[PDB]
Structure formats: C-alpha cells, structure tokens
Amino acid sequence: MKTILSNQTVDIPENVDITLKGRTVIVKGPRGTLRRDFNHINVELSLLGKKKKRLRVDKWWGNRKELATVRTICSHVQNMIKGVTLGFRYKMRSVYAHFPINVVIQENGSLVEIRNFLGEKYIRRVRMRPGVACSVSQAQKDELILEGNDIELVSNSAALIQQATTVKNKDIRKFLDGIYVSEKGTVQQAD
Amino acid sequence: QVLVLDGRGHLLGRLAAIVAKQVLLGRKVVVVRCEGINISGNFYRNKLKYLAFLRKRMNTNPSRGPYHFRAPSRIFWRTVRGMLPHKTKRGQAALDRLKVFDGIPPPYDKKKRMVVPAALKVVRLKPTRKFAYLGRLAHEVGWKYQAVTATLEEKRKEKAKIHYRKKKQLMRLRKQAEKNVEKKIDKYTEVLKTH
Amino acid sequence: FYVPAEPKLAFVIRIRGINGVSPKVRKVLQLLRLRQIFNGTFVKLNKASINMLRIV
Amino acid sequence: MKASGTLREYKVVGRCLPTPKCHTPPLYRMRIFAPNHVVAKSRFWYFVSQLKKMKKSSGEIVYCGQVFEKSPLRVKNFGIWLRYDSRSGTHNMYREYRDLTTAGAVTQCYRDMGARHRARAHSIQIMKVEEIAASKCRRPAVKQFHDSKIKFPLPHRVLRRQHKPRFTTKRPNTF
Amino acid sequence: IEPSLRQLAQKYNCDKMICRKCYARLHPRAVNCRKKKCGHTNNLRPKKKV
Amino acid sequence: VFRRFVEVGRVAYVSFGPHAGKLVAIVDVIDQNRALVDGPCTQVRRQAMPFKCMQLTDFILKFPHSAHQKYVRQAWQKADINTKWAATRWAKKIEARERKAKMTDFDRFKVMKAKKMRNRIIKNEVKKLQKAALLKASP
RNA sequence: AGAACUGGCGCUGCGGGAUGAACCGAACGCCGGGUUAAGGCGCCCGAUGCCGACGCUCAUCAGACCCCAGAAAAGGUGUU
RNA sequence: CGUCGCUUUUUGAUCCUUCGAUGUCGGCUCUUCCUAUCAUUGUGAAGCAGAAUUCGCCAAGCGUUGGAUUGUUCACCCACU
C-alpha cells in the first residue's frame, strides 16, 4: 500500500530523561539506567521540547509489516520507562505434590540451586542473566521473586526456572509440578 | 598498475562478477578483507546451501574430486573461478591476475583501498531484508582462523587511527598555513577556473 | 462526417521465409510475385485482390 | 492488443452499410483506448460485434480521431470499470487511479492488472472511464493524497551506479 | 494439592488448544497453528482433560 | 533527521532528464513518485516530473495548493530565488564544475604554472611551522 | 498401435532452444561492407556499464522462457 | 460412499536398444546409498495414573542376529533380542 506516515508518541515523566545517540536509546532514571539499540528497524525517533519530554516515533515510508513495528518501538520504550522508575517484579510460586521443592541461592542472588524436585537426586543449578536479583519470599510459602530494571532480563530468567522444572517421560496433565510464574508486578509500587 | 578492493559491505556475486571481467581485461586486481563480504538471504538459508555444497562428494575416493574450501578468501576465489573460462589457458591466466587475501596483509595495508558501488549492500539490497556474513558462515563451517584474524584486525586498525590522527594534524597545519596567504595573485586563476 | 474513399492500391511486402509453407499460401505468393523474403509489390485493390490478401 | 507504450484515447464512430432494407443506420460511437489508430479501429469491430449485429465487412467507420483530455495540467482522480478474465472464471472490477490524463490512467491500469492479477491485455475489457471528484473515492491508496499541506521526505536514495567510476574510494551516502 | 495453585499449573499445562495436523500445544484462543508444517491450518481441538 | 521534505511549494533542483540543471517549484504531488512541477522564471514549464529525477533544495515558497502559473511566478520573484540560488554554496559548486569542463588547453597550462607555484609557497611555509613546533617541544 | 490434412526429417547445413533428427527462425557457389529474423544483452559469452517505467513476491525445498524434461485435489488471520 | 496423488522394491503393456553372444535363478562374500523409522537420541499428542502401548515430528549417526525344513527369492517355525 505504501502509506503516508504513522506515529505514536510516548510521554516521559520528570525523574526519567531519555537521550538518544541515534536509533540507540539511552534511558536514565532513578533506579539505574538501561539502553537498547534499534539499528535493525528502520525508523526515526524524535524527542521534542524542553520541560515536557515527548518522544515521537514515526515511519514516513513503509508496508504493512513495516507499519506493524512502529508500535513495537514505542511499547519497548514504555517498558524502559516503567522499569527504570518502578522496576519489574515477577513473583513465582512453587507447586508440588508429595515431594517438597528445596530451592536455595548460591551466588549473591544470581545462581539458583534447585534440589529435591520430584524426588530426584539431580540438582538443577540456574545461573541468571546479568541484572536480576534472586530472593526467596518471606511471609509466604515456596515463592520466588525476581527483581530488576529490564523486562527481558527479568522475564527470560523467569522462563529458565519454569523450563527447568519440566516433567519428562510422563503425563504432563497430572504430575503438575513446577515453579510457575504467578504475578507480573513492579519493585516500587503505585507510581 | 594494480587496484585494491576492500571487500566488506559488498555482495558475494555482484563483486565477483565485476572482478571476473576486470581480470579478463588485463588488470591485476587484489581483493582485500574478503571476510566481511555480505551475501543475500538470511544466515540459516545460506548456511544450508553451503552444507549442501559440502556433500557433493565423489563416491569412489573423495580425495580426488570436489575440493571444498572453507576460508572466505577461497570462497571468494572459487566464485570468480566459476565466472571464468578456467579450462582454457586464457582463463587460467585470468586467475593469475587475481590474488585474494583474507584480512589485510602488510603489502596491502598501507595502500588506498577502493570500493565498487555496484556491489555494496547499502546500494543494492532493500534495507528491510536479511543478509549473511561470509565470515561466520565460514566460521560455522570449519574455518578455524576467525579469532586469529579478528585479533589482527584490531591490531591493524589501531595502527591506522594513529596514522589518520596525525594526518588531520598535517592538514590542519597546511590549512592554517594557507591562511598566511601572501599568494592571492595565484588564487585569482584557480577560483576563476575551479580551484 | 466525410468518410474518404477506402484506398485503391496496396504495397505488399513479404516478411516470412520460404520453407514450411502451405500449398495454397505458396500459390498466391507466387501470383503476387512475392518469392524471396522482403520483396515488395504494388497491388490493385479489388474484391479479387483483397481476398487473396486474407489467404496470405 | 499489446498495449504497447503509453496509450492514446480515440473517439471512433461507425455504422453498418445502407442495405436496400435499411437506409441511414444510426452511426454508433465508442471510446477506444489503443496505442495507435490502426489498433483503435480494430477494437471497434471487436466491441460492436459483441453488442450489435455488425461486422467490418457490412460496416465502416466514419470517424477515428484522437480525443484528448482538456486539462493536461490539472491532477485528476480516475475511476474505471474492468471486465478481465482470470484463469478460472471472469470478473467485473472497479479500480481507481490518479493521473493528469485519461489515457495515462488507463495505461496505469494495464500495467497494474498485469502486475497484481497477471492479466494479459487481450483478456481485459475497459467499460468506462471518468474523472471523479474527491470525497467519492473509496480506495485508501488514492484517498491518502487528498491532503492540503501534504509533506513527506525521500528516505534512502539509490541510483547512478557505473555512471560514475565503478571503482571509487568512497562509500556512497544514501542521505 | 493447594487448589489455588492447582489452577495456576493448569494455565501452563492443560488449558491449551491442540491442532489436528501439526499437533502443536498452542494457547487457549488460537485460530491457526503457528507452525509452518501444516500451512497455518485452522482445525483445532482443546487439549483433552483427565 | 529529515531536515527537508517535499511540500506544496518546495523548490527542487532537477539533476537529469530533459531539464537537467534547472530549478523547479513542486506544485502538487500526484501519486507516490511523480510530482506536478513548473519553473516560471527558469524556463521549465508545467508537467509531472518523477521524484527520482529531482534534488530537494532548502527554499520553500508560500503559494496556494495547485494555483496557476501566475501566482507561482509572483512567489518565485517575490522571494527572488534566482539571486538566492546563485548566492548559495551548492550552485557555486555546479558553477565551478562547468568552468573546469570548458577549460581550454591554454588556460589549463596557465592553471598548471600557477598551481605548482603556490604549492611551493605553502610547502616552503608549512615546513616553517613544523620547524617552530619542535622548537617549542625541545625545551 | 492405427488413419486424415498440411508441412518436415529421411537426403539438409546454418542462427537460436546449455546438450539434441523432427521445435523456432532460416535453407548453402567463394568473399567484403550493411542490416535483421528467431533469440537475447550480471559474468563465463558478442550486446542494458539505460541515473529504464510501474507494480508483485521472502521460500528452514524461492523462482526463472514453445516443444521440454517433474506434479494435483484441499488448505493458509502470509501478503496484495 | 466418493475422490486426488506419488513411487518403480510386484506384475503387466510396449518392442526403442543388444541375435559376427552384454554369461541366465539363488546362496556366499563385501561396499555404499535411499527413508515411506523397527530400535536408539530429543520431542508433541492419546480414550497417556504408573507400567506397557498407540498415533505424529527433526532424524538414516548407528545397529537390525543364531537355527530346523526347502534349490529356493518368498514362506513357516524354534530361540534370543
């Protein structure tokens, strides 16, 4: 079709300041900073105006699979804005039958050492992506909490745990055992 | 005398046909840094038809027969050979004017390198489509010299900064010197006829 | 609307070759004196001569 | 028809011959789009024979002139009606373009039917062509150029290779 | 057992759509199999409950 | 990024084609790659040139959407494009590119003698700034 | 396997179809200049090294030119 | 009940090639290839509780035996796996 442009904008609150080197975006905020390069995605970005901080992503030329990626851009900025002010917290809970899951942390809140999963002798050590924090819950049974700024480093690491607790050579519809994610939240609440 | 082609950013087939005609016309052509030649189509596609190339193997003894080269220099060399009449002695002599080098050797690191804007990926592919590097489909297929080459590139390119840093020292100087004019009798006739 | 006279003569050149030719169509080409390729000939336009030019 | 080159609109009128039974037949008129006037009076006897009982032997044409658009400078929006044939059956079609002349808008059809529908130019019959005014367009590709103070840049420019030295020492900026 | 957690395991293990051609384990609101081997077909059945 | 657009009224240079080397004023974009142009004061009349033919310049003209030749003629010479186009650094470069093409053999000799003269002068002078640069760094 | 009608091959080279009995051009004394048919013009390989026009399409088995040398029903929120 | 295909490991049909000759069944021995997968790796689905099974996917790396009868190919049986 080759339409004339589309554009979404992303409003920026005051404690976070987005600066851009190009199609690379640098996001500094209160609880750290993080950056993403979009040198594959063929769009211009424009932060415009002092004292209000609006980011304008627009694509002038394009087709229907090139128009679909202008929202994917602006929805990745809002995960960089939300994660650098609030952060991400994926609470996940252990579900077990007869055998209780023994889950500890070896290395400074990075390595996760899972044993006594389904009565097996084999420990399952999970080393995580750099930028998340491991923490066994308090005032709750068998809950594991991951905290960090960047969603794709939180969420991929929360996927490695759930994938490691995979029941093999069995009926997966019974034998419902695993450390499944149960909540998608923030580190700081209600801002 | 001899032209020197930097090979990165170029396409495999678009560059090697232009090398194949310029080498039939008597020139001596040297393609340098043929590690970063791009090749169209995504990487898993092009890695398939190179693995299909590897099993084209004569049954009765594979020692004689198809010689699968794996360095991206001889990948580029073999592409030129299929666009030359190499079974004739005019096509044999055409290959002897081609000398292809992977990385940048020291006879050819201080020359000025030329590019072919016919064959560039920036020119010729639509930018929203996927391409493959010849360096890492060589590295995926038995080319065991990627690390020892990419070490010698950054040893090469670090020595090339300190040359260019001091070159723009030199031409800041002869531009600051030509402020001290004293010569505008001679500046009449060049600006009159394109300085 | 003044419609002119449909014209009285034609200049007929041959554009196809000599071989692989049906026997009716190599008789009329023999009658129009078009034997080699690219030979031209002025022809009277008639009912007898138009219906030769449909054969050929 | 080959649709060779840019086309050229012809107004072709013609009538079947006066028989002893019928004097002065009504001299029909069509609107033939053809690359020259010899094809143009050849398509008249294709279309008339499908509509009336007339043919070239018992008829003649009494006009064949190029009829050309009055406003070659003003930009117009054309909506045309098609009757192409497909590989399975045949379909009616409405179809909109946007050109400075009528024969250039129907030329832009024959190219576009061959591009999208693979329809060869002998199998497609133009029914009628006229300019429409804006806010009666239905196609959102034609509709999107109805914008006062429209603006757009030219990204990623590529041209003139081999025109200059094939061999240069200069990576060409695409702006 | 813990029946609030019993539902949360079934969200990843039982509550999905199965295709009759590609046999994939899709998601409970699929219309097409994502896998290319069936040609993105549109005949789906729910994963069978115990 | 995208500092100059096409627009109703944008002055464009025409690089190749039948009007190679003349300015035009973009009047109406017609479909996606073809634009209605004219130059009333630069000897190119009204037609649709393709966009890959033209070169955008940085002069805009505030005339209405698709007016006649007259109002574009007013806006061309109210804004006085032709003196502003000569007084730009890019038409000096296309002026300079044709002066070098019509350089006769006798002038090309005179350029050579006056080129090799002043490059002696700088080289015998840029050596003096090298000579004083070490003389700073020797104490 | 067997008939009809026209041409061809057999008896017949040449250009094009990579290769070829019959296909498409085209028929031949020995040459120079000119031009073309069928076919083509990234490089083998003569000629697009045109600032060619407009669209369509991404394949983890792309596709690519009469005869002609590989495929169907059915299906696809893949795009148009 | 229909109906659309593929393969040349069956048999036909054909008679193009070989009648101044291409040594004609099977077995033994040995190599390599194909996948339309029996097992083995990693998986998806069951009317998958487990165990055993069954249906599908990437997949030919590797294995796929010892005997009684019989010229047998094939068949049938004993035994292991």
Tab-separated table of N, CA and C in Angstrom, chain C:
chain	number	residue	atom	x	y	z
C	1	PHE	N	-19.846	13.810	-41.156
C	1	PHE	CA	-18.597	13.063	-41.209
C	1	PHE	C	-18.310	12.709	-42.657
C	2	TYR	N	-17.289	13.322	-43.230
C	2	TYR	CA	-16.829	12.967	-44.561
C	2	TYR	C	-15.898	11.771	-44.444
C	3	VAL	N	-16.367	10.602	-44.862
C	3	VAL	CA	-15.546	9.396	-44.890
C	3	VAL	C	-14.859	9.319	-46.251
C	4	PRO	N	-13.538	9.200	-46.301
C	4	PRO	CA	-12.837	9.181	-47.589
C	4	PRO	C	-13.074	7.885	-48.341
C	5	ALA	N	-12.501	7.816	-49.533
C	5	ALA	CA	-12.516	6.567	-50.271
C	5	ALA	C	-11.538	5.617	-49.618
C	6	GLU	N	-11.981	4.399	-49.346
C	6	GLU	CA	-11.028	3.395	-48.939
C	6	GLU	C	-10.079	3.155	-50.108
C	7	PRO	N	-8.777	3.078	-49.854
C	7	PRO	CA	-7.786	3.364	-50.899
C	7	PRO	C	-7.729	2.308	-51.988
C	8	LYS	N	-7.171	2.714	-53.129
C	8	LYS	CA	-7.263	1.922	-54.344
C	8	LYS	C	-6.089	0.993	-54.580
C	9	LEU	N	-4.923	1.244	-53.991
C	9	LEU	CA	-3.792	0.350	-54.186
C	9	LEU	C	-3.146	-0.008	-52.855
C	10	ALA	N	-2.308	-1.038	-52.892
C	10	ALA	CA	-1.610	-1.521	-51.717
C	10	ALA	C	-0.183	-1.842	-52.097
C	11	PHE	N	0.726	-1.692	-51.146
C	11	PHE	CA	2.102	-2.114	-51.345
C	11	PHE	C	2.409	-3.286	-50.427
C	12	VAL	N	2.638	-4.454	-51.013
C	12	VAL	CA	2.632	-5.708	-50.280
C	12	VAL	C	4.049	-6.231	-50.205
C	13	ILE	N	4.599	-6.320	-49.006
C	13	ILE	CA	5.914	-6.918	-48.862
C	13	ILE	C	5.753	-8.249	-48.160
C	14	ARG	N	6.720	-9.118	-48.376
C	14	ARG	CA	6.748	-10.426	-47.754
C	14	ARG	C	7.666	-10.353	-46.546
C	15	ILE	N	7.260	-10.940	-45.433
C	15	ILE	CA	8.105	-10.932	-44.254
C	15	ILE	C	8.481	-12.319	-43.755
C	16	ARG	N	7.785	-13.372	-44.157
C	16	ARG	CA	8.161	-14.716	-43.747
C	16	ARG	C	8.965	-15.384	-44.848
C	17	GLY	N	9.601	-16.486	-44.494
C	17	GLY	CA	10.554	-17.160	-45.349
C	17	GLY	C	9.926	-18.075	-46.370
C	18	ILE	N	10.673	-19.106	-46.744
C	18	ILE	CA	10.360	-19.898	-47.923
C	18	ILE	C	9.882	-21.308	-47.586
C	19	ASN	N	10.195	-21.827	-46.409
C	19	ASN	CA	10.088	-23.244	-46.128
C	19	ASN	C	9.136	-23.481	-44.974
C	20	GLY	N	8.273	-24.478	-45.138
C	20	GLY	CA	7.275	-24.817	-44.147
C	20	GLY	C	5.969	-24.140	-44.471
C	21	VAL	N	5.590	-24.188	-45.744
C	21	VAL	CA	4.613	-23.273	-46.312
C	21	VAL	C	3.490	-24.078	-46.953
C	22	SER	N	2.247	-23.736	-46.618
C	22	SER	CA	1.082	-24.469	-47.086
C	22	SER	C	0.908	-24.279	-48.593
C	23	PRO	N	0.289	-25.239	-49.309
C	23	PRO	CA	0.305	-25.157	-50.770
C	23	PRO	C	-0.611	-24.091	-51.329
C	24	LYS	N	-1.655	-23.716	-50.594
C	24	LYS	CA	-2.466	-22.598	-51.048
C	24	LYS	C	-1.741	-21.285	-50.843
C	25	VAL	N	-0.985	-21.167	-49.759
C	25	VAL	CA	-0.373	-19.883	-49.485
C	25	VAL	C	0.927	-19.706	-50.263
C	26	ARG	N	1.550	-20.767	-50.763
C	26	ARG	CA	2.654	-20.563	-51.690
C	26	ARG	C	2.207	-20.576	-53.131
C	27	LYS	N	0.908	-20.599	-53.386
C	27	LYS	CA	0.471	-20.323	-54.743
C	27	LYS	C	0.134	-18.858	-54.914
C	28	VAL	N	-0.488	-18.250	-53.911
C	28	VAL	CA	-0.857	-16.851	-54.022
C	28	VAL	C	0.383	-15.979	-53.928
C	29	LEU	N	1.357	-16.379	-53.107
C	29	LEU	CA	2.633	-15.670	-53.047
C	29	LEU	C	3.385	-15.769	-54.352
C	30	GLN	N	3.161	-16.846	-55.088
C	30	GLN	CA	3.703	-16.978	-56.427
C	30	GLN	C	2.967	-16.071	-57.399
C	31	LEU	N	1.685	-15.805	-57.141
C	31	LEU	CA	0.868	-14.963	-58.003
C	31	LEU	C	1.016	-13.490	-57.720
C	32	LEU	N	1.411	-13.118	-56.515
C	32	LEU	CA	1.634	-11.723	-56.182
C	32	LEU	C	3.047	-11.302	-56.513
C	33	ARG	N	3.850	-12.253	-57.003
C	33	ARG	CA	5.272	-12.117	-57.317
C	33	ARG	C	6.082	-11.792	-56.073
C	34	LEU	N	5.753	-12.451	-54.972
C	34	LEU	CA	6.484	-12.312	-53.721
C	34	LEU	C	7.109	-13.670	-53.450
C	35	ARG	N	8.316	-13.880	-53.975
C	35	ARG	CA	9.014	-15.154	-53.871
C	35	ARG	C	10.136	-15.134	-52.837
C	36	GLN	N	11.065	-14.192	-52.918
C	36	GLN	CA	12.006	-14.046	-51.819
C	36	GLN	C	11.362	-13.309	-50.656
C	37	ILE	N	12.041	-13.356	-49.520
C	37	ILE	CA	11.638	-12.556	-48.382
C	37	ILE	C	11.970	-11.098	-48.668
C	38	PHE	N	11.179	-10.196	-48.075
C	38	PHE	CA	11.377	-8.743	-48.126
C	38	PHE	C	11.239	-8.195	-49.544
C	39	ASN	N	10.424	-8.845	-50.369
C	39	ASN	CA	10.119	-8.328	-51.695
C	39	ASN	C	8.799	-7.584	-51.676
C	40	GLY	N	8.779	-6.402	-52.272
C	40	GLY	CA	7.569	-5.609	-52.265
C	40	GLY	C	6.933	-5.554	-53.630
C	41	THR	N	5.636	-5.274	-53.714
C	41	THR	CA	4.926	-5.244	-54.987
C	41	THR	C	3.700	-4.365	-54.830
C	42	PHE	N	3.462	-3.492	-55.797
C	42	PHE	CA	2.221	-2.743	-55.826
C	42	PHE	C	1.080	-3.612	-56.304
C	43	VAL	N	-0.030	-3.578	-55.577
C	43	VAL	CA	-1.183	-4.412	-55.882
C	43	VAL	C	-2.411	-3.517	-56.024
C	44	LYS	N	-3.149	-3.711	-57.112
C	44	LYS	CA	-4.518	-3.243	-57.280
C	44	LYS	C	-5.387	-3.706	-56.122
C	45	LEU	N	-6.213	-2.841	-55.572
C	45	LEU	CA	-7.113	-3.294	-54.523
C	45	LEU	C	-8.499	-3.506	-55.094
C	46	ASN	N	-9.013	-4.719	-54.931
C	46	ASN	CA	-10.198	-5.177	-55.619
C	46	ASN	C	-10.879	-6.124	-54.647
C	47	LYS	N	-12.043	-6.657	-54.997
C	47	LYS	CA	-12.549	-7.760	-54.196
C	47	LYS	C	-11.750	-9.023	-54.469
C	48	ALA	N	-11.246	-9.164	-55.693
C	48	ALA	CA	-10.440	-10.320	-56.059
C	48	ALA	C	-9.067	-10.268	-55.422
C	49	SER	N	-8.555	-9.072	-55.169
C	49	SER	CA	-7.227	-8.962	-54.595
C	49	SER	C	-7.235	-8.818	-53.083
C	50	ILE	N	-8.284	-8.255	-52.478
C	50	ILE	CA	-8.379	-8.272	-51.019
C	50	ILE	C	-8.486	-9.692	-50.488
C	51	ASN	N	-9.333	-10.518	-51.090
C	51	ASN	CA	-9.486	-11.881	-50.606
C	51	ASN	C	-8.310	-12.774	-50.956
C	52	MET	N	-7.389	-12.330	-51.810
C	52	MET	CA	-6.099	-13.004	-51.833
C	52	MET	C	-5.274	-12.645	-50.620
C	53	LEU	N	-5.365	-11.407	-50.158
C	53	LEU	CA	-4.507	-10.981	-49.069
C	53	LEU	C	-4.977	-11.493	-47.724
C	54	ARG	N	-6.160	-12.088	-47.651
C	54	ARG	CA	-6.530	-12.792	-46.439
C	54	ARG	C	-5.948	-14.193	-46.403
C	55	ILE	N	-5.629	-14.772	-47.558
C	55	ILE	CA	-5.054	-16.111	-47.578
C	55	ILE	C	-3.623	-16.073	-47.058
C	56	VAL	N	-2.963	-14.930	-47.216
C	56	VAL	CA	-1.517	-14.815	-47.135
C	56	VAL	C	-1.074	-13.978	-45.944
